[PDB]
Amino acid sequence: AATTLPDGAAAESLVESSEVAVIGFFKDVESDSAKQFLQAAEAIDDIPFGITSNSDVFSKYQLDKDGVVLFKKFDEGRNNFEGEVTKENLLDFIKHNQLPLVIEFTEQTAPKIFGGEIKTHILLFLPKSVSDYDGKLSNFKTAAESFKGKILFIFIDSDHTDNQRILEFFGLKKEECPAVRLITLEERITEFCHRFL
Amino acid sequence: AATTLPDGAAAESLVESSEVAVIGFFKDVESDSAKQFLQAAEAIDDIPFGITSNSDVFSKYQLDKDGVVLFKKFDEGRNNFEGEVTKENLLDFIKHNQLPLVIEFTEQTAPKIFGGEIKTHILLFLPKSVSDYDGKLSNFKTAAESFKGKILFIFIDSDHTDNQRILEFFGLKKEECPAVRLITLEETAERITEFCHRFL
């Protein structure tokens, strides 16, 4: 499920092996919380998992108690798990922190956007051929900074043929871009409508 | 702007010519109300407009006084405009009555969905191959009754290849359907931040 890490070099190697990586720091690998972590490791194959009981490895990442850390090669670089160690809490934590601050809508990216726990999403339809593209995108990223865990910032490449149906869905023509659409995501459907309202 | 209708025959032709048609019934073609109507007619590209002064056409459609009727080939079939004949009142009237209770997401339909003043949308992902298709669609209509004017009910064909990107947008796979999603539409680096602070 998770690769055992006996030393600092193995921890580092594992962190470098992927865009996103996760280490469980559990003194007792046979403990209930540790099992819960190992169960979380098996439930996801997109990300590699590590596990240490080595207190030098604990200290290398400034852990002085059991814990789990998500490592990422972008943005804030890492997130520390908070609260009770259960499989469901861990999968929630991994999903809420797996994504880049500004996320490019792609095929691999789409299911993880839905996987987030953020209701409000801001879409920027940004043509990759636009003037000052990287400046306009950084502006979106800068604005994304002061909304961490409140609004999910998504950018869509308007020039790409596969995004045209999404442009249509939000009533957009390619020449109306860059454009911004802010959205909130959510006969037993009558009950579904009330809870959403 | 709007085609003149001298007789009952031209009127029916016009009504039959589209999914949604609108007729303005005005004795005097250049009265204030008739003028407002023609301006509303110029502001909507999607539907054809007729104008009549002939009292036979009035009675045909059971108008004794001047007025505006929207005709449609679905749901209740017609809606009568009730209020002062303003351009803004008419455009409001059309947009509120223009669309089916349960609208199929298509290419022609797409711009009219996003433009709607309802903003809170429920999407049924209904594969056209699903067993008991109209029975499943029937329940969607029954629920659509409870939320008319509050939630815009939309269905989409999950089977169709040109809908794949919308499925992905809503984290859905072909097999995971039928399925339902609700969505609410709302609205420089500093301009974005100020726009985003629409929490309060």
Phi, psi of A120 (to 5 degrees): -85, 130
Taking only Cα atoms into account, the Rg of chain A, rounded to an integer number of angstroms, comes to 20
Task: Compute CA A54 distance to the chain's CA centroid, rounded to the nearest angstrom.
Answer: 28
Q: Are residues B116 and B152 in the same domain?
A: yes
Asked if A139's CB is within 8 angstroms of B188's CB, the reply is: yes
Closest residue on chain B to A195 (Cα): B182
Q: Are residues A118 and A76 in the same domain?
A: no
CATH code (residue B164): 3.40.30.10
CA A32 vs CA A21, A36, A87, A137, B181: distances in Å = 22, 6, 11, 44, 37
Q: Which residues contact A145 (CB under 8 A, 6 or more apart)?
A: A101
Q: Are residues A95 and A3 in the same domain?
A: yes
Task: Compute CA B63 distance to the chain's CA centroid, rounded to the nearest angstrom.
Answer: 23
Determine if the peptide bond prior to A178 is cis (ω within 30°).
yes
DSSP secondary structure code for residue B200 in this structure: -
Partners of B170 on chain A (C-beta within 8 Å) are 114
> Of the candidates A111, A147, A166, which has its C-beta nearest B165's C-beta?
A166
> What is the rounded CA–CA span in Å between residue A8 and residue B87?
73
**Residue B187: which domain range?**
100-200
Phi, psi of A142 (to 5 degrees): -65, -45
Q: Express the helix, strand and coil content of chain A in percent, nearest 5 each.
A: 40, 20, 40
The tokens describing A7, both together, are 């030393």
> What is the rounded CA–CA span in Å between residue B37 and residue B29?
10
> What is the rounded CA–CA span in Å between residue B103 and residue B83?
27
Nearest CA of chain A to the CA of B86: how many Å? Answer: 27
Angle at B15 between CA B9 and CA B21, to 5 degrees: 145
Number of domains in chain A: 2
- Count of CB atoms situated within 10 Å of the CB of B161: 6
Which residue, A84, A182, A76, is CA-closest to A125? A182
Partners of A185 on chain B (C-beta within 8 Å) are 181-183
Partners of A171 on chain B (C-beta within 8 Å) are 110-111, 113-115
Resolution of the deposited coordinates, in angstroms? 2.3
Which residue, A52, A19, A40, is CA-closest to A90? A40
Q: Are residues A145 and A184 in the same domain?
A: yes
Nearest CA of chain A to the CA of B24: how many Å? Answer: 29
